[PDB]
Design a protein around this ligand. Structure first.
Ligand SMILES: [Cl-]
Ligand SMILES: [Cl-]
Ligand code: NA
Ligand SMILES: [Zn+2]
Ligand SMILES: [Zn+2]
Ligand SMILES: [Zn+2]
Ligand SMILES: [Zn+2]
Ligand SMILES: [Zn+2]
Ligand SMILES: [Zn+2]
Ligand SMILES: [Zn+2]
Ligand SMILES: [Zn+2]
Ligand SMILES: [Zn+2]
Ligand SMILES: [Zn+2]
Ligand SMILES: [Zn+2]
Length: 266
């Protein structure tokens, strides 16, 4: 190993949490909603030492990887293995295609983000046991700063008179459950899931019922159709599914969106 292990990550939260757990160690990079990585990414995955993805409920293509058939030494790691996933909003009481029932957007909960960084540190310690104390020490520093981020915004959401907000797609369910908030997504779990006409009417009644004055968009066009039907304002709220391309850490990018949400709910 020149720079250490060659680690490849699925998307931005996994790339950020692996990079901060590894720290100075290894060579961490990220492959280039729709998902389906290119032909070169899968080739780069089989040429790497470690590949880390979030969950089978998100990167469904990760389950088709067969390192034994391709004669590859890549060790695929599911960063959220063992974490308890909540039901998809609107499907809580469904008894059971089944992958559509569980919500994967846990990285937006500061507590569950630290839980995923610990699993990454544990799984990296099972592959690279010599540096196990560096992975755990970097993870505990990430968990500590995440738990302090939760303690900081917990009183900020308790005093909020408005605890209901609407976002571009159903991605902030874990964040709302962390601070006792209520949320509704225009689109479903995936941004491609366009609302049906009957569902759009429910979003209209939902905004009117709980006096929602703001729809949080992403940096879609169905959201621009309801700004006339509801008269709400538009503010940005990044679910951190794409790289913000800045010089902030993951928890700093997460805190920024939390501060945008907390100032609006007051
Ligand atoms: Cl329920
Ligand atoms: Cl998604
Ligand atoms: Na509900
Ligand atoms: Zn799994
Ligand atoms: Zn539960
Ligand atoms: Zn229920
Ligand atoms: Zn039954
Ligand atoms: Zn090492
Ligand atoms: Zn070393
Ligand atoms: Zn601190
Ligand atoms: Zn999403
Ligand atoms: Zn900084
Ligand atoms: Zn801070
Ligand atoms: Zn401010």
């Amino acid at each position: 190993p020149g720079k250490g292990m060659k680690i490849v990550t699925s998307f931005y939260p996994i790339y950020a949490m692996v990079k901060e757990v590894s720290g100075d160690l290894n060579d961490v990079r990220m492959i280039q909603a729709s998902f389906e990585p290119s032909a070169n990414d899968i080739a780069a995955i089989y040429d790497a030492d470690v590949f880390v993805y979030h969950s089978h409920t998100l990167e469904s293509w990760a389950g088709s990887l067969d390192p034994n058939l391709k004669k590859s030494k890549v060790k695929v790691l599911e960063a959220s293995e063992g974490m308890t996933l909540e039901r998809v909003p609107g499907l809580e009481d469904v008894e059971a295609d089944e992958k559509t029932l569980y919500d994967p957007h846990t990285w937006l909960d500061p507590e569950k983000a630290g839980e995923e960084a610990q699993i990454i540190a544990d799984k990296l310690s099972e592959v690279d046991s010599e540096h196990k104390e560096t992975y755990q020490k970097n993870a505990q520093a990430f968990i500590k700063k995440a738990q302090e981020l939760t303690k900081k915004f917990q009183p900020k959401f308790e005093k909020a008179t408005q605890k209901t907000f609407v976002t571009q797609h159903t991605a902030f369910s874990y964040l709302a459950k962390r601070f006792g908030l209520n949320q509704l997504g225009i689109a479903g779990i995936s941004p491609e899931q366009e609302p049906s006409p009957r569902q759009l009417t429910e979003i209209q009644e939902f905004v009117k019922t709980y006096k929602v004055k703001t729809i949080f968009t992403e940096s879609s066009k169905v959201a621009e159709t309801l700004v006339k039907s509801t008269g709400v304002g538009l503010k940005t709220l990044n679910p951190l599914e794409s790289d913000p391309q800045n010089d902030k850490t993951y928890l700093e990018n997460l805190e920024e969106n939390m501060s945008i949400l907390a100032e609006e709910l007051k």
